[PDB]
């Protein structure tokens, strides 16, 4: 079955999306990107749509891990305000490759429900992280504020000390 080469194909599909367009993603294009035979495409996946769904799925699991990374050294809610600030301060550069792919996924999800399922599982994770030090009502508000705050750079402001003080107000703690 060869799990590593299945992973490669998903990697190469993702790479074939950020590079050219999802409209352009074909079996041949991905196989030549993955350095793999045409047959492996049909052996592992039932169709381009299962493949795209898996690649987007894996893209969001990457993000989730890039997300909970910021909470490595967080014991407490005050440290969690700091990690949130770090994350919003740090991801002001770069690159809008992920964010570009992600806004593509938000819009596509509103008319492809398998993809919406994947989006939901991705946000469950973010909220679950925050609930380690906040109650859901605060976790939910902080998640939304983090997501909106990130947008407000993808168009283009603003100091760490200032980002921290907005976070601290959305959290009201300590």
Report the nearest approach of its own copies to the CB of residue 133 (Å): 17
Burial state string for 124-150 with b = 16 or more CB within 10 A and e = fewer than 16: eebeebbeebbeeebbbebbebbeebe
Nearer to its own copies, 1 or 174 (CB): 174
Residue 151 corresponds to which tokens in the numbers above? Answer: 């947008």
Nearer to its own copies, 20 or 75 (CB): 20
3-state secondary structure 92-140: CECCHHHHHHHHHHHHHHCCCHHHHHHHHHHHHHHHHHHCCCCCHHHHH
Nearer to its own copies, 73 or 107 (CB): 107
The Cα 86–Cα 78 span in angstroms is 13
Report the nearest approach of its own copies to the CB of residue 1 (Å): 33
| 33, containing H or E segment | helix 27-34
List contacts with its own copies (CB under 8 A).
18, 21-24, 95-96, 99-104, 106-107, 109-111, 116, 119-120, 123, 127, 137, 140-141, 143-149, 151-152, 154-156, 158, 162, 165-166, 169-170, 172
Nearer to its own copies, 22 or 31 (CB): 22
For 69, which DSSP code?
G
Nearer to its own copies, 66 or 120 (CB): 120
Contact (CB, 8 A) for 142 and 171:
yes
């Amino acid at each position: 079955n060869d799990p590593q080469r299945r992973e490669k194909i998903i990697q190469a599909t993702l790479e074939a999306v950020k590079l050219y367009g999802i409209h352009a993603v074909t079996h041949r294009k991905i196989a030549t990107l993955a350095g793999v035979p045409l047959g492996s495409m049909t052996y592992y996946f039932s169709g381009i749509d299962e493949l795209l769904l898996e690649a987007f799925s894996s893209f969001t699991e990457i993000m989730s891990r890039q997300y909970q990374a910021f909470f490595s050294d967080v014991s407490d809610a005050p440290g969690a305000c700091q990690a949130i600030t770090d994350m919003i301060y740090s991801s002001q550069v770069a690159t809008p490759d992920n964010m570009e792919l992600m806004y593509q996924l938000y819009a596509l999800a509103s008319r492809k429900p398998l993809l919406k399922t994947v989006m939901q599982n991705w946000m469950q994770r973010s909220q679950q992280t925050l609930e380690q030090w906040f109650e859901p009502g605060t976790a939910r508000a902080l998640d939304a504020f983090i997501e909106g705050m990130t947008l407000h750079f993808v168009t283009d402001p603003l100091s760490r000390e200032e980002i921290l003080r907005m976070v601290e107000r959305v959290a009201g703690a300590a």
